[PDB]
Amino acid sequence: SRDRKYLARLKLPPLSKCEALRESLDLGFEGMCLEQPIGKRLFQQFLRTHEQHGPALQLWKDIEDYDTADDALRPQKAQALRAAYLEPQAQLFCSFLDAETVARARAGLFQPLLRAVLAHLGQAPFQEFLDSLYFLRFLQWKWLEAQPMGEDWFLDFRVLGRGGFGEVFACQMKATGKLYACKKLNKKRLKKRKGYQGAMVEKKILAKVHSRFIVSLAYAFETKTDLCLVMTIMNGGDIRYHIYNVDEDNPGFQEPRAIFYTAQIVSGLEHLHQRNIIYRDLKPENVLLDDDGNVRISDLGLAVELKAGQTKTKGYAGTPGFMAPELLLGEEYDFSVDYFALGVTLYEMIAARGPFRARGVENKELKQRVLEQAVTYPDKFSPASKDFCEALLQKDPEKRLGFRDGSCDGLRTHPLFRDISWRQLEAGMLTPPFVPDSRAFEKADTEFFQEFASGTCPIPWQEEMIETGVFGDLNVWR
């Protein structure tokens, strides 16, 4: 359904206002169209009416089409893409690059083919969009993004749960009609514990990331009683909810069910650590499942940030079992205390118990079993799972496949992912292995609540406009 009165406060503006934007923004090619879908599309749309860059556009289109393609049609989509653009006078044979990257792709894998067009497409042809209409309309789409979207603009009625900080909800964006889990906090209780620093650190990195295994924050505002942060909804429940209490006499999960979730996690942590950031506490109950069936990772008090120029960070906190060996003694540890935690999680996924313990001891024996004891496996495991879990559960962090080379490119090779080609999961087209059932104050604080509230977080907002049709139905020409 759709609302009108809140959709009415949203109009397409004039041009004497988009001049304060012109100077203060400095989006280099990369930060704009390639990442911002309203940019993407508007610039797509610039290459659509301008006839000279059809071949380069469709080129890139069909690269995104092959990127996500299935696994018995990749040979065919390859022979489709090779016959259209590459070789003896193709009919959409473009003429702006020379002929050095034509040689590059002939072996397979067409990833370097893509970056060859990107580099150029962002230089000589890119000049025009800027000095053309489509871009300007973006400024005006952009203009309305830089606006104050307060408590008025969202609704409350059904609540997720209660840990302590406040009350967690699902909320609909009124004008458009999009749903969002918006976490709400009793302000007085927040200042009551100096819990400022764990939350903002948690906020600062939410808006900076868009990985569909990480709760993507859309908005940030101040009501009066509470502070809020819209993130991409998750219903049914968490993974413990499923592991232990979905099917009782058949405890735990099957093989492709746990695999599918483990992979979605691998890429969430990749994004986590690509920006130099730790999760520390990683477990099933700290992982959710949406109505669509694509999981994420949740609850981010334990979300410490690593700075720039420094190497490591120290401490003592987390969850007994999902701490690493080098985390319990209290030494300098890399991100793989998460990957160690994941190993324990993956076990408790397909075990119905903590890996060292028995199902359902003090923290000293749990620490002594975290460090020393190896994993004694039963019959239920397939060999690919056993050969892989021995990597995560190593007693030191240099032999455990942690964050290496900048991405999990060494992890993604590992035997357990043969069926799963490492593309489709990052997009969102794979049928997940279980679909669910649906139906008085000082100055220092009020100056912070408005600092905290940066109104909008840009890109999920952009996505909301494009997916809901809001972009489509006010980007009108006739």
Q: Where is the binding site for ATP, in residues?
A: 160-168, 183, 232-234, 299
Q: Does 424 bind a copy of itself (CB under 8 A)?
A: no
Point out which span in 124-132, 150-158, 290-298, 401-409 binds a copy of itself (CB under 8 A): 124-132
Q: Kind and range of the H or E element at 346? A: helix 336-349
Distance in angstroms (rounded) separating the CA atoms of residues 218 and 458: 7
Number of residues counted as binding a copy of itself (CB under 8 A): 20
Alpha helices (runs of H) in 146-220, residue ranges in sequence order: 187-191, 196-206
Distance in angstroms (rounded) separating the CA atoms of residues 25 and 139: 11
Task: Convert residues 47-86 into a mask of x (bound to a copy of itself by CB under 8 A) and - (unbound).
Answer: -xxxx-----------------------------------
Question: Most distant CA pair in the chain: distance in Å?
Answer: 78
Which pair of structure tokens corresponds to residue 377? 């496996």
CB atoms within 10 A of CB 403: 21
- Percent of the chain that is helix, strand, coil (3-state, to 5): 40, 10, 50
Task: Convert residues 436-475 into a mask of x (bound to a copy of itself by CB under 8 A) and - (unbound).
Answer: --------------------------------------x-
Does the annotation mark 281 as catalytic? yes
52 vs 68, beta carbon nearer a copy of itself: 52
Q: Does 131 bind a copy of itself (CB under 8 A)?
A: yes
Residue type, 138: F
Which residues, including other chains, have CB under 8 Å from residue 49's CB and lie 6 or more apart? none
56 vs 302, beta carbon nearer a copy of itself: 56
Q: What are phi and psi of 87, to 5 degrees?
A: -125, 175
Least separation in angstroms between CB 16 and a copy of itself = 5
DSSP secondary-structure letter at 9? Answer: T
Point out which span in 42-50, 59-67, 176-184, 402-410 binds a copy of itself (CB under 8 A): 42-50
Distance in angstroms (rounded) separating the CA atoms of residues 277 and 275: 6
Q: Does 137 bind a copy of itself (CB under 8 A)?
A: yes
Q: Does 15 bind a copy of itself (CB under 8 A)?
A: yes
* Torsion, Cα of 239, 243, 247, 251 (10° steps): 170
Which of 21, 73, 133, 159 touches a copy of itself by CB under 8 A? 133
Q: Does 478 bind a copy of itself (CB under 8 A)?
A: yes
Pairing mode, strands 287-289 and 166-173: unpaired
Q: Does 23 bind a copy of itself (CB under 8 A)?
A: no
- Token pair 């830089």 is found at 146
Which pair of structure tokens corresponds to residue 120? 């150029």
Which of 16, 24, 95, 197 touches a copy of itself by CB under 8 A? 16
* Cβ 301 vs Cβ 459: under 8 Å: no
Q: Does 191 bind a copy of itself (CB under 8 A)?
A: no
Distance in angstroms (rounded) separating the CA atoms of residues 53 and 44: 10
Determine which one of 62, 226, 281, 338 is catalytic: 281
Which of 35, 128, 285, 291 touches a copy of itself by CB under 8 A? 128
Which of 14, 161, 163, 406 touches a copy of itself by CB under 8 A? 14
Least separation in angstroms between CB 14 and a copy of itself = 4
Residues within the interface to a copy of itself (CB under 8 A): 11-12, 14-16, 45, 48-51, 128, 131-133, 136-137, 474, 476-478
As annotated, the active-site residues are 281
